Amino acid sequence: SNGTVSPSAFLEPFSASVWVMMFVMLLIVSAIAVFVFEYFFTIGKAIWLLWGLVFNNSVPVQNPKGTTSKIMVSVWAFFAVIFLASYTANLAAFIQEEFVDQVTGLSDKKFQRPHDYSPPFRFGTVPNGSTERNIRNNYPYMHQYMTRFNQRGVEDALVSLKTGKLDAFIYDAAVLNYKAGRDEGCKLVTIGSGYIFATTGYGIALQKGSPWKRQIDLALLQFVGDGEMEELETLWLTGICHNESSQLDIDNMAGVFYMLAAAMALSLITFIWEHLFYW
Amino acid sequence: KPFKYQGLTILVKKEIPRSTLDSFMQPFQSTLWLLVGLSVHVVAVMLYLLDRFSPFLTLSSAMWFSWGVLLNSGIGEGAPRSFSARILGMVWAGFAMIIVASYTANLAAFLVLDRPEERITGINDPRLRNP
Amino acid sequence: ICTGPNDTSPGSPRHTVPQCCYGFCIDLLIKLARTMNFTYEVHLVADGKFGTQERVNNSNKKEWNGMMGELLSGQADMIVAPLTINNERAQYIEFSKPFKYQGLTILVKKEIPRSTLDSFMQPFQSTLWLLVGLSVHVVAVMLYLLDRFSPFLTLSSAMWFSWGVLLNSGIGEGAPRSFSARILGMVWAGFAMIIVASYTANLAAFLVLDRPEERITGINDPRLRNPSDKFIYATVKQSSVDIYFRRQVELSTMYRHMEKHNYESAAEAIQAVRDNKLHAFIWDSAVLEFEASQKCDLVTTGELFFRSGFGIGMRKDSPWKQNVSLSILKSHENGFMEDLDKTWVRYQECDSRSNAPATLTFENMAGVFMLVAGGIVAGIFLIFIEIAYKRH
Numbered sequence: 001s002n003g004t005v006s007p008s009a010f011l012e013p014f015s016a017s018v019w020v021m022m023f024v025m026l027l028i029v030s031a032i033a034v035f036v037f038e039y040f041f042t043i044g045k046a047i048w049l050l051w052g053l054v055f056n057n058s059v060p061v062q063n064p065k066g067t068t069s070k071i072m073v074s075v076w077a078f079f080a081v082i083f084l085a086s087y088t089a090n091l092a093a094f095i096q097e098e099f100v101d102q103v104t105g106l107s108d109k110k111f112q113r114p115h116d117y118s119p120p121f122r123f124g125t126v127p128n129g130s131t132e133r134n135i136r137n138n139y140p141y142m143h144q145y146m147t148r149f150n151q152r153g154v155e156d157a158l159v160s161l162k163t164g165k166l167d168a169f170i171y172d173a174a175v176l177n178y179k180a181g182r183d184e185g186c187k188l189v190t191i192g193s194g195y196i197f198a199t200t201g202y203g204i205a206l207q208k209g210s211p212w213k214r215q216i217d218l219a220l221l222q223f224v225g226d227g228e229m230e231e232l233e234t235l236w237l238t239g240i241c242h243n244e245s246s247q248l249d250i251d252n253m254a255g256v257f258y259m260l261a262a263a264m265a266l267s268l269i270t271f272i273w274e275h276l277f278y279w
Numbered sequence: 280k281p282f283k284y285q286g287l288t289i290l291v292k293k294e295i296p297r298s299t300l301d302s303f304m305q306p307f308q309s310t311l312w313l314l315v316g317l318s319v320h321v322v323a324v325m326l327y328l329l330d331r332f333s334p335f336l337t338l339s340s341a342m343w344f345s346w347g348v349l350l351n352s353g354i355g356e357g358a359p360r361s362f363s364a365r366i367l368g369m370v371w372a373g374f375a376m377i378i379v380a381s382y383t384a385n386l387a388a389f390l391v392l393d394r395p396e397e398r399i400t401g402i403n404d405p406r407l408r409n410p
Numbered sequence: 411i412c413t414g415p416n417d418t419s420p421g422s423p424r425h426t427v428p429q430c431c432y433g434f435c436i437d438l439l440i441k442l443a444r445t446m447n448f449t450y451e452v453h454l455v456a457d458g459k460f461g462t463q464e465r466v467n468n469s470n471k472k473e474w475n476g477m478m479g480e481l482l483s484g485q486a487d488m489i490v491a492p493l494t495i496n497n498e499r500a501q502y503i504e505f506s507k508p509f510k511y512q513g514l515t516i517l518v519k520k521e522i523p524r525s526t527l528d529s530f531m532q533p534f535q536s537t538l539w540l541l542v543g544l545s546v547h548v549v550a551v552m553l554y555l556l557d558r559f560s561p562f563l564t565l566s567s568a569m570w571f572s573w574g575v576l577l578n579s580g581i582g583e584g585a586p587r588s589f590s591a592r593i594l595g596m597v598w599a600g601f602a603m604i605i606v607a608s609y610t611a612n613l614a615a616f617l618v619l620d621r622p623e624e625r626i627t628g629i630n631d632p633r634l635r636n637p638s639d640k641f642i643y644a645t646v647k648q649s650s651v652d653i654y655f656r657r658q659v660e661l662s663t664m665y666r667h668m669e670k671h672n673y674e675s676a677a678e679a680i681q682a683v684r685d686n687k688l689h690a691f692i693w694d695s696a697v698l699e700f701e702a703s704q705k706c707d708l709v710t711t712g713e714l715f716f717r718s719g720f721g722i723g724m725r726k727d728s729p730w731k732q733n734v735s736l737s738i739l740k741s742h743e744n745g746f747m748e749d750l751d752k753t754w755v756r757y758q759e760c761d762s763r764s765n766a767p768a769t770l771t772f773e774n775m776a777g778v779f780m781l782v783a784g785g786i787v788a789g790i791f792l793i794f795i796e797i798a799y800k801r802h
Contacts, residue, residue: 010377012769013769013770014769014770015769015770015771015772017771017772018770018771018772018775021779022779026779026782029786030782030786033786033789037789037793040793040797044362044365048358048365048369051369052369052372053579053580055372055373055376056351056578056580057348057349057351057372057375057376057379058347058348058351058352058353059348059368059369059372060344060353060355060356060357060358061358061580063580063581063583066796067566067796068789068792068793068796070570070581071785071788071789071792072785072786072789073579073581074573074574074577074579074581075781075782075785076579076782076785077574077577077578077579077581078577079778079781079782079785081577081578081606081610082530082613082775082778083778084376084380084610085609085610085613085614086613086614086617086770086775087380088380088383088384088610089610089613089614090614090767091380091381091384092381092384092385092388093766093767094766094767095381095384096766134743137743137744138743138744138745182409197748198742198743199511199742199747200739200742201508201511201719217500218497218500218501221495221496221497221500222497224496224497224716224717224718225496225497225498225654225657225716226657226658227658227715227716229717230715240405240409245385245388245389245394247305247306247307247308248306248307248308248311248381248385249308249310249311250310250311250314253311253378253381256374256377256378259370259374260318260370260371260374263366263367263370263371264325264367266366267329267363267364267366267367268363270362270363270366271329271363274333274335274361274362274363275334278334278335
């Protein structure tokens with residue numbers, strides 16, 4: 001999926017408790033301080049100076065005249081530059097395009113109810129397999145919904161899912177893991193970061209009461225214990241996208257634009273409030 | 280007996296960084312650039328529109344203030360006089376700080392367009408393993 | 411109702427008292443008992459060992475302990491337990507198809523970041539802090555001297571200029587007048603910019619401590635491949651993992667580090683890891699991930715190795731093999747087993763696991779809040795100092 005960035009991502013660097021403690025309590029304490037230190041310069045001018053100093057942008061302010069007030073402003077500005085450096089130290093990593101899964105799992109309501117959506121969700125499986133048997137014995141209605149989206153094979157399903165013809169492909173785990181590893185551009189991923197439903201394995205078929213069952217079982221267990229399975233799977237079943245500089249769009253900066261929109265709204269509300277107050 | 284010990288290895292061409300004239304404009308998309316440019320002007324106009332009709336900051340003063348606080352220059356020493364204008368201006372300065380910090384956090388990253396695509400991790404690398 | 415030993419401590423009188431048992435194995439067994447018409451009688455093990463082929467002292471005869479020790483002796487005939495399938499155990503007794511596919515993993519301490527008041531001042535050394543504190547004053551003073559003795563900015567104004575240049579405040583009002591001072595002020599401003607840029611560059615790493623050693627990487631971790639006397643890791647004595655580590659040809663060396671610290675039970679090893687007594691715990695993935703989800707200060711590493719499954723052990727000559735195999739597989743195919751996982755293993759109290767950088771909180775910069783409080787309480791005294799000064 002293309003993914004998106006939450007509007008609250010740029011508030012995530014610092015917890016809301018830290019934000020409210022510094023920017024309401026600590027800020028007002030420092031401002032009322034500097035005001036009373038200057039008294040021994042309206043409080044509005046004081047809070048304006050503190051606000052401008054928290055994030056320095058050459059904002060026009062009226063500096064206090066007292067020596068102790070100047071010391072207070074200097075220590076607050078040291079605090080503010082610490083804040084700015086800490087906030088911008090990991091701002092790039094916090095504002096990162098995160099990829100959200102559109103389907104939570106095999107029990108998602110999109111699979112359960114495909115009709116109640118503006119697009120008909122297009123998802124099916126390759127017939128003549130254990131997957132269709134499991135789907136039938138578990139979910140008959142969703143199987144008869146499968147019937148019109150059946151794919152000829154795995155490569156056909158992959159090339160159809162690369163385009164807009166299909167949305168999801170349901171099939172056994174190992175093949176999909178191999179395909180996702182060997183996919184070009186890593187545009188195909190399994191849901192749930194490796195969500196497995198049947199959690200079954202591949203076995204060696206034998207005739208009923210075959211005398212070879214014991215020897216085969218011992219051989220496979222010996223191979224598993226000696227670790228050969230590890231290099232055999234990392235030589236054949238290994239993938240490319242496994243174990244693996246972006247522009248910023250309006251969606252990435254959606255939160256700050258919402259903040260400024262709310263600021264414009266509250267400024268208009270305060271404008272109305274002061275007109276009624278003076279009236 | 281050998282006179283030089285060595286082994287097989289891979290030679291590749293170094294992709295020298297070719298810097299375009301718009302590289303520093305890469306971090307911010309063109310649509311974002313236009314949107315923030317329009318936002319600067321609309322904030323600049325609304326500041327003096329709100330300030331002039333205050334019973335309790337002209338064109339040039341307001342626009343210079345907005346541009347300077349956006350660029351952190353201090354070109355215009357003119358502060359708004361009305362309260363709601365104060366809040367609007369301080370939020371505008373905060374948004375300017377956030378956007379310039381975001382631009383800084385990725386300007387140098389897009390200033391040099393070097394990626395480890397040409398780097399080869401021996402013979403176990405995929406692009407050589409997979410023709 | 412399960413009859414088991416009362417005291418698990420070695421060298422203690424172990425008498426069979428009936429406790430009450432319930433869990434994934436228990437309700438799996440009741441599922442088998444409902445699907446297949448039979449009666450059960452659950453009882454605990456004489457000891458706390460899963461099972462290991464061991465030599466006995468007399469006559470050097472092989473024997474099994476724990477589950478298979480009871481099973482081969484006829485005391486029990488079927489096992490519901492997290493019993494790993496391996497070559498050694500399959501030779502004598504037979505295992506059904508796995509009811510939980512899982513590998514091996516390492517559990518370690520989360521090691522929450524150490525928060526200190528002086529974290530923010532860490533980037534620069536104390537000597538450098540003192541030297542720059544002297545440098546701001548000395549630059550202020552020769553700026554004052556240069557402007558005072560100009561051929562054609564008082565002391566307090568000079569200090570305010572220097573301080574507002576060192577830290578961006580705007581307090582300093584009034585540029586130097588003499589041309590000699592107007593270049594030294596500029597170069598001091600450049601020095602201040604260099605200082606603040608250097609401070610900003612890497613204060614994040616010093617504010618929140620990193621995890622150079624905590625980032626375990628499977629069994630390929632250097633302190634796991636080559637065990638030292640400082641990093642101690644162990645597991646449950648006489649279990650599947652002991653046999654596995656004894657079987658590999660390359661890992662034998664660390665197995666020699668492994669034998670002298672083995673714990674009697676998984677819970678004891680988990681507790682030892684919890685209180686920073688055991689650095690790392692080698693165990694099956696399922697129990698470790700459940701513990702990490704439940705015990706919030708414990709963390710898994712990943713890189714699963716020796717993938718296997720928990721199986722139902724049973725005697726080599728018993729008629730229940732096919733029946734239990736089909737029953738357990740039918741429990742696989744339908745909705746039973748993922749429901750059981752949801753009800754018993756799939757629930758989190760804390761996760762705090764993400765690839766994003768850590769979110770800054772109170773303790774991360776409690777130092778700067780204490781610093782601003784100290785600034786407030788210092789100002790509330792320097793005001794009386796300056797009032798006394800104005801009195802003079």
